[PDB]
Scaffold this active site. Structure first.
Site, short mmCIF file in Angstrom:
data_model
loop_
_atom_site.label_atom_id
_atom_site.label_comp_id
_atom_site.label_asym_id
_atom_site.label_seq_id
_atom_site.Cartn_x
_atom_site.Cartn_y
_atom_site.Cartn_z
CB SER A 59 2.97 1.90 6.21
OG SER A 59 1.65 2.21 6.61
CG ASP B 271 0.23 -4.21 2.72
OD1 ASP B 271 -0.51 -3.46 3.38
OD2 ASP B 271 0.80 -3.83 1.68
CG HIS C 169 -0.43 0.21 2.52
ND1 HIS C 169 -0.14 -0.83 3.36
CD2 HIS C 169 -0.15 1.34 3.21
CE1 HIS C 169 0.29 -0.36 4.52
NE2 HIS C 169 0.29 0.96 4.45
#
Ligand SMILES: [Zn+2]
EC number: 3.4.21.19
Length: 215
Positions: A168, A92, A50
């Site tokens: 992240s 991810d 992402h």
């Protein structure tokens, strides 16, 4: 997300010990997307799918600043991505290759790439840290978040330590300072999780990064 266990310390000497390859990422879109990552090779860095998707198909939009200390305080300067390879599984995870900087230096040369764990002894209840760049702290500052692994299944892991938008792609380190996973985020009031680098993921990384080092 913030959890009952919120134990975070700022790392000011970012180029000391295992902290050097921890990296601050800025993706220029629309707005500036912030994230984290970890250098694992001469020209390679790991982060989430992402964060890589924030570039909207343009790798040049992604800049990495290894060992960033605070806003406009990048001891190793920055590097611009040139190629991105997303993990083919559900995890991810994404691999980012960078071109050298103006001084013709490689991201994995100005800093020593992190050592990847084989995860042979990783287990629930072990003390770990997730270190990266939380967005609830001053711009571009590195923070280490402490906690324990609370769940391990396949290529997924969960833990009880706190993180915030910006984290992240932060590396998950075990006590030996080896990367055992890559943080992706969490669920409010429940847990935070990461892609657990098991055999499948390890093989994927090894096939796409010739110089990655597993202990
Ligand atoms: Zn503490």
């Amino acid at each position: 997300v913030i959890l009952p266990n919120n134990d975070r310390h700022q790392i000011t000497d970012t180029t000391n010990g295992h902290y050097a390859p921890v990296t601050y990422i800025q993706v220029e879109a629309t707005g500036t997307f912030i994230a984290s990552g970890v250098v694992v090779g001469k020209d390679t860095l790991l982060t989430n799918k992402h964060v890589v998707d924030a570039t909207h198909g343009d790798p040049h939009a992604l800049k990495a600043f290894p060992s960033a200390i605070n806003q406009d305080n990048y001891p190793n300067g920055g590097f611009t991505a040139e190629q991105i390879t997303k993990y083919s599984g559900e995890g991810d995870l994404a691999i980012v290759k960078f071109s050298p900087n103006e001084q013709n230096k490689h991201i994995g040369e100005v800093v020593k790439p992190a050592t990847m764990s084989n995860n042979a002894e990783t287990q629930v209840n072990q003390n770990i840290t997730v270190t990266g760049y939380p967005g609830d702290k001053p711009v571009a500052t590195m923070w280490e978040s402490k906690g324990k692994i609370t769940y391990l299944k396949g290529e997924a892991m969960q833990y009880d330590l706190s993180t915030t938008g910006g984290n992240s792609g932060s590396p998950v380190f075990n006590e030996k300072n080896e990367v055992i996973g890559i943080h992706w985020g969490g669920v409010p009031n429940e847990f935070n999780g990461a892609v657990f680098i098991n055999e499948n993921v390890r093989n994927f990384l090894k096939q796409n990064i010739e110089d990655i080092n597993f202990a």
